[PDB]
């Protein structure tokens, strides 16, 4: 028995209202639930590919995740805004942010439980994204 | 191997910067981790007593948790703002909100895995509380 995201099996999202819950549960699921429960949907295929958009924006995300202050959400957001400064973000920048946070969540997670740091990855993303960003990234999720 | 909140054993908080991280992990821990990790600190004793402040403000929190739309964070916040309308909240109202969300998280959680609803309880609280609220409730956590 392991956390099962609502959209785990989904190939697409219907409403744009599902966008925040979806990204949230994705990042939480990347903590540890991923190695016990898989998600074959086309939706989770797309999400995982955001790692590519992350690498494109942050260059080396492995070395970046290790460095960043995951104990401090506010400061992490400040660091991200070095790479993505504007409040108006592009669809690639938004994917990068989700991509980075999901990687951080996997890096910092335990095998069967989450950690303070892996949870904080979830809140860094929330800090970063506004409602206008959710409309845009929605276009990659159908 | 269960989630272990950073402040699980703590009797107090040192910095006001720990306040958001603490409440967050408390609410997550109320999902299911509470049955496998005991938190004897005076801090968690105080937090759990916020159920009293919840009952005081929302009358019957059991019947209220069942009714509310936990699938919809925005709407849950709207419902709460019926009871606590002002942006300037009192220390009792802030405790009520934490109290209610922790109860909701326990109600909706599974036995070994959180649920979409139990997680949403966490986000309802985040929706409700601003930084000025964290300074106030900090006075109950030392």
Author numbering:
A (entry chain A), B (entry chain C): 8 to 149
Any passages from the paper?
VACV strain Western Reserve gene B14R is an immediate-early gene that encodes a 17-kDa cytosolic protein (B14) that contributes to VACV virulence and inhibits the IKK complex. The interaction of B14 with the IKK complex depends on the presence of IKKβ, and B14 bound to the IKK complex prevents phosphorylation of the IKKβ activation loop. The structure of SeMet B14 was refined to 2.7 Å resolution with residuals R/Rfree = 0.223/0.244, residues 8–149 being observed in the electron density. Four molecules of B14 are present in the crystallographic asymmetric unit, forming two dimers with highly conserved overall folds (0.11±0.02 Å rmsd over 142 Cα atoms) and dimer interfaces. Despite being a cytosolic protein, and despite being purified and crystallised in the presence of the reducing agent β-mercaptoethanol, a single disulphide bond is observed in B14 between cysteine residues 15 and 46, locking the N-terminal loop with the α1-α2 loop. There is no obvious functional role for this disulphide bond other than stabilising the structure of the protein. Superposition of our structures onto that of myxoma virus M11 in complex with the BH3 peptide of Bak reveals the hydrophobic BH3-peptide binding grooves are occluded in both A52 and B14, but not in N1. Equivalent residues (63–66 and 82–90) occlude the groove of B14, helices 2 and 4 again being much closer to each other than in M11 and three side chains (V64, F65 and Y90) pointing directly into and blocking the groove. However, only B14 is able to block signalling downstream of TNFα/TRAF2. This is due to the ability of B14 to inhibit signalling from the IKK complex via its interaction with IKKβ: the nexus where IL-1 receptor, TNF receptor and TLR signalling pathways to NF-κB converge.
Vaccinia virus, the vaccine used to eradicate smallpox, has about 200 genes, and many of these encode proteins that help the virus evade the host's immune defences. This paper concerns the vaccinia virus proteins A52 and B14, which block signalling pathways leading to the activation of the NF-κB transcription factor and thereby diminish the host immune response to infection. The structures of A52 and B14 are entirely α helical, both comprising seven α helices and adopting the Bcl-2–like fold. We show that both proteins are Bcl-2 family members but lack a surface groove for binding BH3 peptides and, consonant with this, are not anti-apoptotic. Instead these proteins have acquired the ability to inhibit signalling pathways that activate NF-κB.
